[PDB]
């Protein structure tokens, strides 16, 4: 069976091709006093804590060499040179890092085939439609990727630098400001769950603005590791806000839903209308609730009273990237696509921008 | 040779990567030539 | 009905097996190791090696 | 008439299969393992041309040819024999 | 003629029961579906079709006839002769034209006398 | 009956096929891939002789084509264009018509463009130097070099490529009346 | 009137090698074009049989 | 010798409407940001989309590009390090880097940036191509006709084996911005209030010709009447995108009306159906002596031709390409064929190059400038910084054609 890995900022997803759901899900963390994933969180006191991919883009090529033997060996416990792999890549990666991933495949791995795909082309296969744009938002970058009959337009994309990060960091702040202790490094973690379990997206912030300050009926409560129970309330949707609002982490930037806009109003007259009526969100910082009808009602207010909006928010949303993945690499169609060892050794490691799309 | 039919129009190029291409025109009787078993190229070894 | 119309899934295409020891098209398959073999000597070959790693693994 | 249309839709879905590309890759025995040939009436071969990068030049025989001049003259010299005598 | 790629029977209200079965053949030309009549049934289950078997069907009288597995099955490690066969060349369908030149005497030679009674004959 | 094409045919033209193996599935082709291992790759400086200043650029080569002279370098020739001395010229080229550093100029231009005569008429610096003609320019290339050549062969008719440029041009400035006579007269004398 | 001959200079070839590898862009384009188009159209077809098989 | 070696160079395509950059091998830019770009005067820069659309006190809106080169260096700079730092994320000392260049820049513009790009930005090597002579190479012809009309000029340059005939370029004023003035002047004449969609708190549905009913925007900080311009230019290019088709012939009133409406809806929720001056304004670019002695595009492509040796007018009528945004208006191509084919000598054979897409027009310089950069046989021509601590002033003119 092939491999799909999809490498992301925060975690990695990898499993099997054909299967509904990854078989494993870890951060990308690499420790070294080298441990990699949640045995590395385990030992924050003594190891040296490091993220190898930043906005989607790999910076340390040891540690995802490292990342990737450790997802090999110890998650799917499987022979890299027994399986074709197909990697993951963000959109308006450099040339050079796709070359090295087929290097290292390669050289290093000696895998039999290896394809890498862009991942909102994979989200938009996990949606089932042709024509759409994507805007996945994980943990350190956010994009909007226009794509029509599966052909990415690489110069519609639009890239946003906030993400899940930030707005675990922007809630870390809002919660000191209601007087809760969060500021050191490990209760990060705790800000993370809270943040997963109660915020939501406000349809309208102002309304809930105010009637969370007249009204304690909007208000949750959740409990700290120790024992200690915490009341938040009004603080449950103006973090999401940010993604909207992104002047409240202080960046001067346009929200989520202007940069969809902006990245539909880039691309073609014609193609536009596929477009609004698939707009797709995939990543995890859109698991929100109440972020498809936020969404769907700022591009109605920016988009056409004549143009039709459809937000496709599956609940499944978080993993859509991978479980598209799956279903390209268990297509029949596909299996012509696979870089071989033979091309490989034959063509180089440029072979890549050849074959994959 | 795989699959045994002719394929219509062709030219051999080669590719960046050292890869010998088929490059391919289109022509209104393709069917009539996906059907068919002038200057008519096969491979030999 | 199933019984008359079985719904059967087409068969898997083989695996060319080539032999390791000359890399030629397989044309035999050894009874203990399980490793095909094209030739005699290859088979002497892959015996002796067999005979040594079942020494040193035990 | 329910057969009728779910014949007509099959054929539908069929003609939508159809009008999908039929092939994007070949073999790597026809790529490079087998040279293209074509034998004629006379039994004369011809093998196909293969459009190369330019070859490395191993002496002065390689001379240049202007594109654009051979749009309004023709690449050859007259013959001496339909040339005028000198003036 | 061609290798079965499937035999998918079609369900239908009665007005199971079935009134199709779709069988695919694939030569090297390419792949075509058929739409045969479901007493085609019977003879699909005397003859044994399975996918992977090359078959040929007559227009005519509509009986199938096997004539083995398709030889991209067979590995150099099993045994068997008789049962493969290579793939079909040339479209799936085909017309075949046979001409045959006998003499008067040869059919009277047939008909005199047709080849137990045969055994001791 | 064929098809000619320079990138391709028409908007409606089929793909290109790319070979690839795994077409017909991997798992056919497992053996033979499990068989062997890849050949290593590297992202490797290497010196251009055609480059006379030294600078390496990057290549992805495999380990042992590191250091190979590079290919192409073979490419590399200029158009033959002489020189001469200060002396030659004094002794041998002086012509009233034309200064030495114009004629200095017309010879860098020569070697810069590959005699390619239009380029050197489009780069010549006419502000600075009289205004040439090109069958100017080719008359002065050509009949230095055939009397460099001589002192140390098709020779050039300025007159003859004179005369072709302008009847090229009077036949091109002709108003569509008068192509129209003129096809219509040859369509009338057949 | 014939010019001298003289044999192909470095920016000949150049301009061969660019006409070669500008050919090769456009058909890889075309390409990539048409194997997109192929491959999303499968997947639909997989929801779609997918779907009308599970019901 | 083989194919061509790709050195990892990058491209930088710095228009006055769009900056196209991307990696040397690369069919497509993969950025293409607007050139505009946000100054505040304290100079901050807000240079790309995600900065520029957001509303904010005393930011102006400027280019560095004038006439087609660059004016303000130091928003040049600017634009520079926001493309390498944002897009490229590469340092700028690791990989050559190939620009383009106008037609006909400077002797001095050309050696400013070549000095900018040694001593600032410390590039391996460099080199300095023009868009006609890429726009050429991306479609595999050495030789042409090159006619670009962008924002800023509709020009005609000769390309003779690779090589700019810089006597033949004809440049003309009637380009993207003279049809966003006309598509300004078209909408004042109509009364129609151009509202920038960052004022637009929310709008509801009205009908065609009912006035609208949109709410603005509260806590608004004043912006600057450069920023309020650029908004509206760019709702008038999406119009002008969206609306405008250049006539299949001569512009006649009779057979414009017979054709069918289309409706068009701006941001503040108002819609029209425009009728016939959707065809009326492109004209301008082929007739303008109608508009309210400026050259029409086939009288551009015409007298450029004219002016170049007859030996060579064959290979130009014989490869005319299009290239600029500008072309991409409904039925500009076919209405510049068919004035070609009327206007151009019967001994001649004139063929436009059929590419005709967003890609292939906008971006064709960019691909030209990849497709060499990627040969093996152009890996002589880069200027080495060697070569800069030299010929900082004299190679830099003799290096680059
Ligand atoms: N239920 C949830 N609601 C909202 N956010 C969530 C939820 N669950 C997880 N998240 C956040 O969503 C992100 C999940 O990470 P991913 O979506 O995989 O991003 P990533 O793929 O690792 O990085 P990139 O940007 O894709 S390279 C983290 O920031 C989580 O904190
Ligand atoms: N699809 C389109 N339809 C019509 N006009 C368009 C289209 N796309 C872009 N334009 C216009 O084309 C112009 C920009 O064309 P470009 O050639 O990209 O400009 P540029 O090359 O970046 O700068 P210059 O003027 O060439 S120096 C603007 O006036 C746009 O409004
Ligand atoms: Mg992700
Ligand atoms: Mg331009």
Same mark, same amino acid.
């Given at each position: 069976a092939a491999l799909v890995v999809d490498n992301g900022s925060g975690m990695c997803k990898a499993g099997f091709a054909?299967?509904?759901? =990854?078989?494993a899900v870890f951060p990308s963390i690499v420790g070294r006093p080298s441990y990699v994933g949640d045995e590395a969180q385990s030992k924050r006191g003594i190891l040296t804590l490091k993220y190898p991919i930043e906005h989607g883009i790999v910076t340390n090529w040891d540690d995802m060499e490292k990342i990737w033997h450790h997802t090999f060996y +110890? *998650?799917?416990?499987?022979?890299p040179e027994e399986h074709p792999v197909l990697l993951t890549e963000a959109p308006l990666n450099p040339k050079a890092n796709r070359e090295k991933m087929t290097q290292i495949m390669f050289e290093?791995? +000696? #895998? =039999?085939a290896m394809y890498v795909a862009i991942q909102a082309v994979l989200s938009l296969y996990a949606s089932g439609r042709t024509t759409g744009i994507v805007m996945d938002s994980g943990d350190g970058v956010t994009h909007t990727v226009p794509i029509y009959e599966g052909y990415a337009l690489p110069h519609a994309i639009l890239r946003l630098d906030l993400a899940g990060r930030d707005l675990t960091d922007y809630l870390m702040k809002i919660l000191t400001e209601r007087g809760?202790?969060? #500021?050191?490094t490990a209760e990060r973690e705790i800000v993370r769950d809270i943040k997963e379990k109660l915020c939501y997206v406000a349809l309208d912030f102002e309304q809930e603005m105010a009637t969370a300050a007249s009204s304690s009926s909007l208000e949750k409560s959740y409990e700290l590791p120790d024992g200690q129970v915490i009341t938040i309330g009004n603080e449950r949707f103006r973090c999401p806000e940010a993604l909207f609002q992104p002047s409240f982490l202080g960046m001067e930037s346009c929200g989520i839903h202007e940069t969809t806009f902006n990245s539909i109003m880039k691309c073609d007259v014609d193609i536009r209308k596929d477009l609004y009526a698939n707009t797709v969100l995939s990543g995890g #910082? #859109?698991?929100? =609730?109440?972020i498809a009808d936020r969404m769907q009602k700022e591009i109605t207010a920016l988009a056409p009273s004549t143009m039709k909006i459809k937000i496709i928010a599956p609940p *499944?949303?978080?993993?859509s990237v991978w479980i598209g993945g799956s279903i390209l690499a268990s297509l029949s169609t596909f299996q012509q696509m696979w870089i071989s060892k033979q091309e490989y050794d034959e063509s180089? =490691?440029?072979?890549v921008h050849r074959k994959c799309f | 040779t795989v699959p045994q039919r002719c394929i219509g129009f062709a030219r051999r190029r080669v590719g960046r990567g050292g890869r010998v291409l088929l490059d391919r025109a289109h022509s209104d009787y393709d069917s009539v030539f996906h059907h068919l078993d002038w200057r008519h190229f096969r491979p030999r070894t | 009905f199933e019984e008359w119309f079985p719904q059967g899934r087409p068969p898997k295409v083989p695996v060319r097996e080539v032999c390791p020891?000359?890399?030629?098209?397989?044309?035999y398959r050894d009874p203990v190791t399980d490793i095909p073999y094209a030739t005699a000597r290859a088979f002497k070959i892959i015996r002796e090696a067999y005979k040594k790693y079942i020494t040193a693994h035990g | 008439f329910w057969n009728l249309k779910t014949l007509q839709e099959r054929e539908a879905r069929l003609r939508l299969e159809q009008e999908?590309?039929?092939?994007?890759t070949y073999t790597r025995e026809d790529a490079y393992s087998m040279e293209y040939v074509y034998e004629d009436v006379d039994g004369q071969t011809e093998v196909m041309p293969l459009w190369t990068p330019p070859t490395p030049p191993?002496?002065?025989?390689?001379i240049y040819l202007d594109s654009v001049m051979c749009l309004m003259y023709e690449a050859t010299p007259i013959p001496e024999a339909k040339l005028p005598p000198v003036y | 003629e061609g290798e079965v790629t499937e035999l998918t029977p079609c369900e239908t209200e009665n007005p199971?029961?079935?009134?199709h079965v779709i069988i695919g053949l694939k030569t090297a030309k390419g792949t075509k579906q058929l739409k045969l009549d479901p007493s085609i049934f019977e003879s699909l289950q005397k003859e044994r079709?399975?996918?992977?078997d090359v078959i040929y069907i007559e227009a005519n009288s509509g009986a199938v006839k096997r004539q083995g597995?398709?030889?991209?099955?067979?590995?150099?490690?099993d045994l068997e002769a008789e049962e493969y066969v290579p793939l079909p060349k040339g479209d799936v369908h085909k017309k075949k034209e046979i001409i045959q030149d006998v003499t008067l005497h040869d059919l009277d030679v047939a008909n005199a006398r047709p080849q137990i009674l045969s055994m001791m004959g | 009956r064929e098809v000619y094409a320079l990138?391709?045919?028409?908007?409606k033209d089929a793909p290109p096929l790319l070979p690839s193996d795994?077409?017909? !599935?991997?798992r056919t082709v497992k053996a033979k891939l499990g068989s062997k291992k890849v050949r290593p790759w590297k992202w490797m400086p290497f010196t251009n002789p055609?480059?006379?200043? !030294?600078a390496m650029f990057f290549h992805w080569r495999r380990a042992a084509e590191? !250091?190979?002279?590079?290919?192409?370098?073979?490419?590399n020739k200029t158009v033959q264009v002489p020189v001469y001395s200060e002396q030659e010229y004094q002794l041998?080229?002086?012509?009233?018509?034309?200064?030495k550093a114009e004629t200095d100029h017309l010879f860098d231009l020569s070697r810069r463009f590959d005699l390619r005569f239009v380029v050197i008429h489009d780069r010549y610096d006419h502000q600075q130097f009289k205004k040439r003609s090109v069958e100017d320019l080719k008359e002065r290339y050509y009949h230095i070099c055939a009397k460099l050549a001589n002192v140390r062969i098709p020779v050039f008719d300025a007159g003859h490529e004179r005369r072709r440029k302008e009847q090229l041009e009077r036949l091109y400035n002709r108003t569509p009346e008068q192509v129209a006579e003129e096809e219509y007269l040859l369509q009338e004398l057949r | 009137l014939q010019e001298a001959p003289r044999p192909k200079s470095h920016w000949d070839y150049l301009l061969e090698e660019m006409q070669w590898m500008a050919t090769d862009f456009a058909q890889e384009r075309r390409w990539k074009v048409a194997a997109a188009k192929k491959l999303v159209r499968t997947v639909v077809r997989h929801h779609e049989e997918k779907q009308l098989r599970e019901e | 010798v083989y194919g061509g070696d790709e050195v990892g160079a990058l491209v930088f395509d710095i228009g006055s409407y769009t900056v196209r950059a991307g990696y040397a091998?690369?069919?497509?830019?993969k950025v293409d940001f607007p050139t505009a770009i946000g100054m505040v005067v304290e100079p901050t820069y807000y240079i790309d989309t995600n900065a520029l659309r957001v509303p904010r006190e005393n930011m102006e809106a400027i280019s560095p590009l004038k006439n087609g080169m660059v004016e303000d260096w130091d928003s040049f700079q600017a634009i520079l390090d926001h493309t390498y730092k /944002?897009?490229?994320?590469?340092? %700028?000392?690791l990989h050559p880097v190939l620009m383009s260049e106008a037609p006909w820049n400077t002797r001095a513009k050309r050696e400013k940036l070549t000095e900018l790009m040694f001593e600032?930005?410390?590039?391996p090597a460099f080199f300095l191509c023009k868009t006609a002579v890429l726009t050429a190479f991306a479609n595999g012809r050495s030789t042409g006709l090159i006619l670009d009309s962008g924002a800023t000029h509709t020009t005609a340059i000769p390309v003779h084996d690779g090589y700019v005939?810089?006597?033949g370029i004809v440049k003309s004023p009637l380009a993207g911005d003279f049809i966003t003035m006309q598509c300004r002047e078209l909408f004042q004449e109509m009364n129609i209030?151009?509202?920038?969609?960052? /004022?637009? %708190?929310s709008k509801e549905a009205v009908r065609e010709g009912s006035p609208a009913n949109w709410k603005r925007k509260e806590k608004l900080p004043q912006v600057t009447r450069s920023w309020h311009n650029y908004m509206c230019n760019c709702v008038i290019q999406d119009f002008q995108a969206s609306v405008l088709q250049v006539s299949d012939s001569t512009y006649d009133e009779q057979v414009a009306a017979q054709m069918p409406t289309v409706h068009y809806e701006f941001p503040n929720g108002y819609n029209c159906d425009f009728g016939a001056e959707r065809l009326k304004i492109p004209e301008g670019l082929f007739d303008?002596?109608?508009?309210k002695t400026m050259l029409g595009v086939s009288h551009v492509v015409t007298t450029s031709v004219g002016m170049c040796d007859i030996d060579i007018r064959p290979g130009l009528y014989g490869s005319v390409i299009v290239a600029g945004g500008?072309?991409?208006?409904?039925?500009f191509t076919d209405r510049l064929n068919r004035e070609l084919s009327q206007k151009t000598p019967p001994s001649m054979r004139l063929k436009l190059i %059929?590419?005709?897409?967003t890609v292939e027009r906008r971006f064709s310089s960019w691909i030209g400038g990849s497709i060499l950069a990627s040969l093996g046989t152009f890996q002589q021509m880069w200027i080495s910084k060697q070569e800069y601590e030299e010929g900082?002033?004299?190679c830099v003119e003799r290096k680059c054609p």
């Open positions: 054909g299967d509904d759901a =990854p078989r +110890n *998650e799917l416990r499987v022979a290093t791995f +000696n #895998t =039999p809760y202790s969060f #500021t050191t #910082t #859109t698991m929100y =609730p109440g *499944e949303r978080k993993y180089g =490691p440029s072979i | - | 020891v000359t890399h030629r098209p397989a044309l | 999908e590309a039929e092939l994007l191993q002496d002065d025989s390689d | 199971k029961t079935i009134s079709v399975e996918a992977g597995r398709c030889d991209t099955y067979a590995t150099e490690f | 990138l391709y045919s028409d908007k795994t077409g017909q !599935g991997y055609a480059r006379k200043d !030294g590191e !250091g190979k002279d590079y290919p192409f370098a073979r490419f041998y080229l002086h012509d009233d018509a034309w200064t | - | 091998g690369e069919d497509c830019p /944002m897009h490229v994320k590469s340092e %700028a000392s600032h930005y410390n590039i005939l810089q006597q209030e151009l509202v920038p969609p960052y /004022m637009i %708190a303008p002596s109608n508009v500008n072309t991409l208006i409904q039925s %059929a590419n005709n897409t900082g002033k004299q």
